[PDB]
């Protein structure tokens, strides 16, 4: 649905007048033609209109795309799942649709799908891993896109590279602490790094990664994140030998189950069972 | 900082080329003058540029405003605090800055500050409560703005009005369930309603409000919200007589304390102490 329709739909749903929203920045003729998709409007005049509608741009865009997040971000979660479940078919299908590679955006995801398919078919995707590596290593302002991309690409990279990326994003990651669903998505990626380091028996960089995640300024309502911080800290303690930390891991699992986070309680249940299995000294007496 | 500078700062921080971002939709001369704030650009061409920067508009705007949420939303949290703490001075100061009332936005917050000052000085603000009531009652697309406004205005309104608003927003509130920090802010307002109904000894509409909040589709990572749902449900059970529900309320408090949500654990601690004090039958044996 084009911007003209969405603005007018929001204007009528909030019982506003064209004058109330257009003020003395836009004409009725200018406003009408915009509604019918005859004319575009300067960006400062769109934000003016949204400002007077009392509507945020992210809310706006999420209506213009028929109540759906943007295709790149939704394709990125599909990619995540298809690789988890060894779904070569979904991966191969997403590879076809991005094979166009019209812009940088289509090259990164192309390279991401090829590189994950390479891992599933034990084939070289030397070119495509290089595209990904070069894009990520030259990010000095790290946004949501790179965070989504990095949660998804992380495990194809050697630990020196992951450490490089982690050390090099601390700063900006902090700046948007006040950002909604971004500050929190930054933390979740740090947990993914800790998980991946713990899983690679590279405990030394997991300790350094967690201590950084603790120093991140975390609002007391960010309870999934604060839970992850605590859980994984006790999991590090366990690996340094303390069965006192196993009760704390179990109690965090019980509390997920108490509040009906049953699917997440089971993921942590499976992880702590998988952790005791691979390092049996944790539980020893 | 104007849009031109922000785009170019993001472009250089991500080591992109003017051609990579401008593609064949914008000229170098057009792009440069935009950077120097000589020319604006059509809204579809700004979103094009942000799309190629791999940056979301909300992220973008949060950089253009020097890493700060928009003044209206930050003024709204200040208003919340100043009313909690009986700070007539901050309220009176915010009233001065909006006394301009240039647009709808400045009229709503003006009316909100006057109405909260009226409650603190036991004076009539009959005109201003009417402005607020009329704005809220005619919202068929309920956005974040109205949610922030309503958390803040809620308690000046009779319970029939609050029920009216609650029944009338279920639908749209659901649509943006997938929305980040919005779906979740919708739930928190529902808890505020439940709190306010429980506090007005109007248990009957608290039961109806909670049952609706339970039917809301809540992702398992939304743990502060799922915790609130569970806590307040057991608090309703308590009020219908079951000391079995008091252990569950205490365990949810203990888990906030375990994960370092110490300020939120104390708020719930104080509330359950204040709840037992006003309805002593809860604990009875």
Numbering used by the authors:
A (entry chain A), B (entry chain A): 1 to 285
Sentences copied from the publication:
NIP is expressed during high bacterial population density, secreted, reimported into the cytosol, and recognized by NrpR, which leads to upregulation of sar-BGC. During environmental acidification, SAL cytosol is acidified, which is sensed by a pH-sensitive histidine switch in the cytosolic transcription regulator, NrpR. The protonation of histidine during cytosolic acidification promotes high-affinity interactions between NrpR and its cognate intercellular signaling peptide, NIP, which leads to upregulation of sar-BGC expression.
To elucidate the molecular mechanism of pH sensing by NrpR, we determined the crystal structure of cytosolic receptor NrpR (amino acids 1–285) to 2.6 Å resolution, the first full-length structure of an LCP receptor. The crystal belonged to the I21 space group, and each asymmetric unit has an NrpR dimer. The overall architecture of NrpR is similar to the DNA-binding members of the RRNPPA family of regulators. Each NrpR subunit is composed of 17 α-helices and has two distinct functional domains: an amino-terminal DNA-binding domain (helices α1–α4) with a classical helix-turn-helix (HTH) DNA-binding motif and a C-terminal helical domain (CTD) (helices α6–α17) that has the characteristic tetratricopeptide repeat (TPR) motif-containing domain. The two domains are connected by a linker helix α5. The TPR motifs form a super-helical structure in the CTD with an exposed concave surface. The putative NIP-binding pocket of NrpR is lined by the helices α6, α10, α12, α14, and α15. Contrary to this, the side chain of H144 is located at the bottom of the predicted NIP-binding pocket of NrpR and positioned to influence NrpR-NIP interactions in response to pH alterations. Since NrpR was crystallized under neutral pH conditions, the crystal structure failed to divulge the pH-dependent allosteric changes in NrpR that lead to transcription activation of sar-BGC.
